[PDB]
Amino acid sequence: DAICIFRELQCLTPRGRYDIRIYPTFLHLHGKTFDYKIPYTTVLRLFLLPHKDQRQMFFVISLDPPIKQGQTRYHFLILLFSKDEDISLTLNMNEEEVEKRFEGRLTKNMSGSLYEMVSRVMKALVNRKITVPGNFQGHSGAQCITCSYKASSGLLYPLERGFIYVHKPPVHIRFDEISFVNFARGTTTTRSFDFEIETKQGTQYTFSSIEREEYGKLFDFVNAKKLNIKN
Numbered sequence: 001d002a003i004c005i006f007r008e009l010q011c012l013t014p015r016g017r018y019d020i021r022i023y024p025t026f027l028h029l030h031g032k033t034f035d036y037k038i039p040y041t042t043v044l045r046l047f048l049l050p051h052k053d054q055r056q057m058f059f060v061i062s063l064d065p066p067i068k069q070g071q072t073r074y075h076f077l078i079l080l081f082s083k084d085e086d087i088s089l090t091l092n093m094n095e096e097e098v099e100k101r102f103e104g105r106l107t108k109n110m111s112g113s114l115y116e117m118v119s120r121v122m123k124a125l126v127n128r129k130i131t132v133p134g135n136f137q138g139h140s141g142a143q144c145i146t147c148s149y150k151a152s153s154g155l156l157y158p159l160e161r162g163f164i165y166v167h168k169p170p171v172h173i174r175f176d177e178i179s180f181v182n183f184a185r186g187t188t189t190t191r192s193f194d195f196e197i198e199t200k201q202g203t204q205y206t207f208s209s210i211e212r213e214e215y216g217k218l219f220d221f222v223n224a225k226k227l228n229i230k231n
């Protein structure tokens, strides 16, 4: 029986509504049609990312190996939360257990926003810090840039030492993986900028349809971070 269960979470990747059942060594993502049992040892990284609208949060779980849904491979689990939603949790464990098990990181009875509770429980169980944005300031106080990638609109987050784009497909690129970056501008009167990244392995990523105001914030970031610009 589970330590706790988070019900009816909005998953973006893979898309659907899933319960997350929390066990000592794995989580169970349980939906109507599919389910996946995911050992914590397969979780590489955790991210908590504020949507630019200030009303939603992404929770991103990086996986290796990926989960398989037919021929589709998902290297990330992405959950989407309203900042508003609240939850009360009662861990299916006695009080003294939890203190020993989690080094005092959790208590038996907990209350808070759903996104914070999921992040806290995941943090404790995987024994990993949550990756958040650093000090990047975008346009109008957003910590991300709105852009298109592979013909889908999404959000690019400049992190302390990397970039992550959500959600279709998600992309995480560490600074140490980057060969160079470049900027290009088209002739449209809006959404005219492209930001391109080439990795050391030769892979290329283009984030396009970037507004000029956001391009300017991204430009300062890339320079502040001393990334190599190739014109």
Ligand SMILES: [Cl-]
Residues within 6 Å of the ligand: 188, 189, 190, 191, 192, 193, 210, 211, 212, 213
């Ligand atoms: Cl523009």
